[PDB]
Swiss-Prot record, chain A:
Gene assigned in the entry: SEC18
Additional facts recorded: Present with 5920 molecules/cell in log phase SD medium.
Chain ranges passing through the membrane: none
Name of protein: Vesicular-fusion protein SEC18
Subcellular localization(s) per the UniProt record: Cytoplasm
Chain's role: Required for vesicle-mediated transport. Catalyzes the fusion of transport vesicles within the Golgi cisternae. Is also required for transport from the endoplasmic reticulum to the Golgi stack. Seems to function as a fusion protein required for the delivery of cargo proteins to all compartments of the Golgi stack independent of vesicle origin.
Subunit structure: Homohexamer. Binds to SEC17.
UniProt record similarity statement: Belongs to the AAA ATPase family.
Swiss-Prot record, chain C:
Parent-record interval covered: 27 to 86 of 117
GO molecular function, one term: syntaxin binding
v-SNARE coiled-coil homology domain sequence ranges: 2-60
Organism of derivation: Saccharomyces cerevisiae (strain ATCC 204508 / S288c) (Baker's yeast)
This protein's encoding gene: SNC1
GO-annotated cellular components: cell periphery; cellular bud; cellular bud neck; cytosol; endosome; endosome membrane; Golgi membrane; plasma membrane
Membrane topology: Single-pass type IV membrane protein
PTM characteristics: Palmitoylated by SWF1.
Cross-link Glycyl lysine isopeptide (Lys-Gly) (interchain with G-Cter in ubiquitin): residue positions: K37
Cytoplasmic side: 1-60
Protein name from the UniProt record: Synaptobrevin homolog 1
Main location: membrane
Classification of source organism: Eukaryota, Fungi, Dikarya, Ascomycota, Saccharomycotina
Curated annotation (Swiss-Prot), chain D:
Subcellular localization, as worded in the UniProt entry: Membrane
Protein name, as recorded: Alpha-soluble NSF attachment protein
Subunit text: Binds to vacuolar cis-SNARE complexes composed of the v-SNAREs NYV1, VTI1 and YKT6, and the t-SNAREs VAM3 and VAM7. Interacts with SEC18.
Positions where N-acetylserine occurs in the chain: S2
Entry's Gene Ontology BP terms: autophagy; intracellular protein transport; SNARE complex disassembly; vacuole fusion, non-autophagic; vesicle fusion with Golgi apparatus
Stored InterPro entries: NSF_attach, TPR-like_helical_dom_sf
Name of the gene this protein is made from: SEC17
Function: SNARE complex protein that binds to cis-SNARE complexes on membranes and is required for vesicular transport between the endoplasmic reticulum and the Golgi apparatus and for homotypic vacuole fusion. During the priming step of membrane fusion, is released from cis-SNARE complexes by SEC18 to establish a pool of unpaired SNAREs, which are required for interactions in trans during docking and fusion steps. Can displace HOPS from SNARE complexes, which may be a prerequisite for trans-SNARE complex disassembly and subsequent rounds of priming, docking and fusion.
Key word Acetylation present: yes
GO CC term (a single one): SNARE complex
Lineage: Eukaryota, Fungi, Dikarya, Ascomycota, Saccharomycotina
Residue location of crosslink Glycyl lysine isopeptide (Lys-Gly) (interchain with G-Cter in ubiquitin): K253
Main localization (coarse): membrane
Length: 89, 283, 60, 282
């Protein structure tokens, strides 16, 4: 249910993926304090990913794998903008 | 020849400061300390002549301490240099480091930052090669380069900064090493060909490919020599390889670069960490 | 033949420069020595000035 | 460590000369000035240890003034003031310190060359830099140091040509040519000298003198005769003679293609082309 969620923008650091399983799932691993679980979030108004709760990533940081970085051309520790996404609208 | 042990005993006997009632009738204790230092120096020269370098270093150290107590700081620093000298020849790196530290402090306190910088560079060399204390060596090299810069000695500061940047990059501090390489480039504008390359390599060890590309462009546009140099092509190839995430292509470029210009252990480590960063990216 | 002569001249000049590079090592050492004795000299000169002044005051 | 402010206050207190009745019983004031200078030097070394370079320079300056009052070291302290002011980014105080040190020494030439460098790069006072370089070169010549005087004269001629004084720059280039003739080490310098001289003579609309310089260089220095610089100068002379600005531009591009031009030459040839345009207006 994506009807209600905080859409406020957050600036998050790109860091190495926590492990191979998270990279395989291709889901943005976020802390519970960052965003709700199992919701679509857009980044830079271009890159959409599904959030999953992860206690290994501290709040204010976003995890990416190598392929997502290749797609966005991002380096480690780069700052990116994240917001809530609504494809249906 | 006099017995060095007897001379040291006499120096110790004379090195006792006047205390209590005797202080009201005894002159300045500086002369007693000077005589004790002379006796220690004699005993220590006898020891060095016997190739007992460590005992001679200890005796110079005692003489330097007595000279400090006498107020003759410059003689104490020279004797400390002698202590470091003989300890290094004797294989006692720790006592050599200590002697260099006292000599450096004495010289800096007297405005001789040049002597301090020379001996700080020697101390950093001792730390890096003999004791493997890489952080202290980095600190010593940075300080020596800074003081040399304060003396307008561009080349020694450049040497000290080369050593500092090399150790810092090998120590995981890629950003600081790249900054020192930028300083070297700015001081050396008008080593550069390599500097640019090394800087870029450090920026690529930090996964900042954009900064490496910026460094390459700056080197190409500012230094015509670097633009047509093989180092520039190699750096561009490495930047392209990291951009495409093709580790094998990076290895091929490294082998090609080695075939014409042999790589050094510093570059080996940087590129190994870069390839392992690609492997981490692969994870 | 021109390129071989050029190579020979370059080798000779490298020879001269390493020799010159060995002399400048001896020169840097000597300069550190002469900056150690000149510091001593400045200190001794000041000490002599002061001592002579103290004797000047004594005789006066 | 002692407070540098307290040391400076003590130095100021001791730096007051004896006045009135006290002067009849107080010895020479030189010792008081020496003590004040020592206190200032201590406070200033403390400042330097704290990287407060400007305050340390001011304290060396006070110590140098006290040393001057004592009859001594003041110039060296001024040199230290120059060093720390330059490291601290205070170019004006560095210039002042170099000036007092130069006056005391008159070393003067070295510090005059450094002062000219400071004026040219930091303060952009090109006239004073030209004066400093000329004076430094003259004193170096008086010491028979041919190469240092030659360096100072190169700087002076470069700035003078950039400053609109083409004739004087050409004269200095002639002096450089005469001093460097017969020396195997400075051959290339000569090769450029001739060219530069001719360029200056061509910036002054004086094509005949440029041709004379080219002929003199060709006949006197065999290396310059076959050098690319000689051909380029001859081509420029021919272009100015025919008044073909485009031909001059083509020759400049050809010269750049093999030997990169520098900003000095760019300016000289730009003024020359603008002079052709002025002739076209004429």
């Amino acid at each position: 249910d994506m009807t209600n969620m905080d859409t406020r923008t957050r600036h998050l650091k790109v860091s190495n993926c926590p492990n191979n399983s998270y990279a395989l799932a291709n889901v943005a691993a976020v802390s519970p304090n960052d965003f709700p679980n199992n919701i679509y979030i857009i980044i830079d108004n271009l890159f959409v990913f599904t959030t999953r709760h992860s206690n290994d990533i501290p709040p204010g940081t976003i995890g990416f794998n190598g392929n997502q970085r290749t797609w966005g051309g991002w380096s480690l520790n780069q700052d990116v903008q994240a917001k809530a996404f609504d494809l249906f609208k | 020849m006099s017995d060095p042990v007897e001379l040291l005993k006499r120096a110790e006997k004379k090195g006792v400061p006047s205390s209590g009632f005797m202080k009201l009738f005894s002159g300045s204790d500086s002369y007693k300390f000077e005589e004790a230092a002379d006796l220690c120096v004699q005993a220590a020269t006898i020891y060095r002549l016997r190739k007992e370098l460590n005992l001679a270093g200890d005796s110079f150290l005692k003489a330097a301490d007595y000279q400090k107590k006498a107020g003759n700081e410059d003689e104490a620093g020279n004797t400390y240099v002698e202590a470091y000298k003989c300890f290094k020849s004797g294989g006692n790196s720790v006592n050599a480091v200590d002697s260099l530290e006292n000599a450096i402090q004495i010289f800096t306190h007297r405005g001789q930052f040049r002597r301090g910088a020379n001996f700080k560079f020697e101390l950093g060399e001792i730390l890096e090669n003999d004791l493997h204390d890489y952080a202290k060596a980095i600190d010593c090299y940075e300080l020596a380069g800074e003081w040399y810069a304060q003396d307008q000695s561009v080349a020694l500061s450049n040497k000290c900064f080369i050593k500092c940047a090399d150790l810092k990059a090998l120590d995981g501090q890629y950003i600081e090493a790249s900054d020192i390489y930028s300083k070297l480039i700015k001081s050396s504008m008008g080593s550069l060909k390599d500097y640019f390359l090394k800087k870029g390599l450090c920026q690529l060890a930090a996964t900042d490919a954009v900064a490496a590309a910026r460094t390459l462009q700056e080197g190409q546009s500012e230094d015509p020599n670097f633009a047509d140099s093989r180092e520039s092509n190699f750096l561009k190839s490495l930047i392209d390889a990291v951009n495409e995430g093709d580790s094998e292509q990076l290895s091929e470029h490294c082998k090609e670069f080695d075939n014409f210009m042999r790589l050094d252990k510093w570059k080996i480590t940087i590129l190994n960490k870069i390839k392992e960063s690609i492997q981490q990216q692969e994870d | 033949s021109r390129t071989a002569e050029l190579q020979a001249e370059i080798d000779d000049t490298v020879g001269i420069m390493r020799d010159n590079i060995n002399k400048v090592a001896e020169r840097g050492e000597r300069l550190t020595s002469i900056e150690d004795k000149a510091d001593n000299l400045a200190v001794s000169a000041q000490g002599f000035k002061r001592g002579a002044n103290r004797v000047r005051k004594a005789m006066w």
